[PDB]
Design a binder for this molecule. Structure first.
Ligand SMILES: [Zn+2]
Ligand SMILES: [Zn+2]
Lengths: 179, 181
């Protein structure tokens, strides 16, 4: 898994044509007052909206309240095969747990239509505190569970967060420490 | 920051001889009975040992007990400029906190001699639970603090962990998501 500020991770998206619209989209969604930003912040709670980005890439814009205490056995632990997740928090704070799929127990085997494997919870997993402007990238080996709150951002149990989950085909996204 | 199982992250170390050399060391240290593995596991507690790997790359092999409760304001929060950290846990479990340098308050400005910026603690930062075989990679934008314990691995307060922090010159490391088009 990768995580960090979108504004520090721009170099990840340069010099590739397929990624160009995507990077533009991530920046637009974060820009206060932009069309994409206004659209995302106008989402009714517990709804989503899909935006096509070309080359098999699309964004799932969503808003919801946090559900699970970080110190609990709750949460929906999942991983994917076709797609890499680019999770961008637009407003609010979200807790994410992440663990390697080889450390997790499969509950529901891969469902191709939903591009989804479901795991038993791993409560003690790494915990990412994703505030607005932070990007978390989850690959095939990253089991992840979202919608956690911690004591410092408990208000988002009743005040919705806003985010985009960009799905990009893994065939396009090949993480390397070299170009 | 990047984190994951070393055995799931092999694809990262492709297409340069220098990354290949780095990867070879990381794998050797995890292999029970290897020269590097024995060297790391024989360290006395609270000591470290430096191993040059070529190309300006070197490993700081270390052993120590965990010091700070995760729910505390303790911890030495730092970032670097010249080097990228490859932190590999060889035995035990370690908690690491990581936060973007833009959310941290500078305490000690950059010291070029030691390649170090020191920050005020960010106790609520993301928390990485690094068990044996896990790798955390910290780049210049990643402020990080080590030696945390959580309740699920509190035994390493009294029993030492073993790890390597491999320092790679920034010029060797270019994080990319796709081929350049
Ligand atoms: Zn996902
Ligand atoms: Zn460091």
């Amino acid at each position: 898994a990768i995580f960090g500020e979108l504004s520090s991770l721009g170099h990840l998206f340069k010099k590739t044509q397929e990624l160009e619209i995507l990077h533009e989209y991530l920046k637009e969604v974060m820009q206060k007052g932009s069309k994409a930003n206004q659209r995302v912040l106008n989402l009714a709670t517990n709804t989503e909206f899909q935006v096509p980005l070309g080359h098999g890439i699309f964004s799932i814009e969503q808003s919801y309240c946090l559900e699970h205490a970080k110190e609990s056995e709750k949460g929906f632990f999942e991983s994917h095969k076709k797609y890499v997740d680019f999770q961008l928090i637009v407003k609010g704070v979200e807790g994410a747990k992440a663990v390697g799929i080889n450390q997790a127990v499969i509950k529901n085997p891969y469902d191709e239509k939903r591009d989804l494997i479901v795991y038993e919870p791993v409560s003690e997993a790494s915990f990412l505190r994703l505030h607005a402007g932070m990007l978390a990238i989850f690959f095939e080996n990253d089991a992840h569970a979202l919608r956690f709150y911690g004591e410092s951002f408990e208000k988002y149990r009743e005040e919705p967060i806003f985010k985009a989950v960009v799905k990009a085909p893994k065939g396009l996204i090949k993480l390397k420490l070299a170009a």
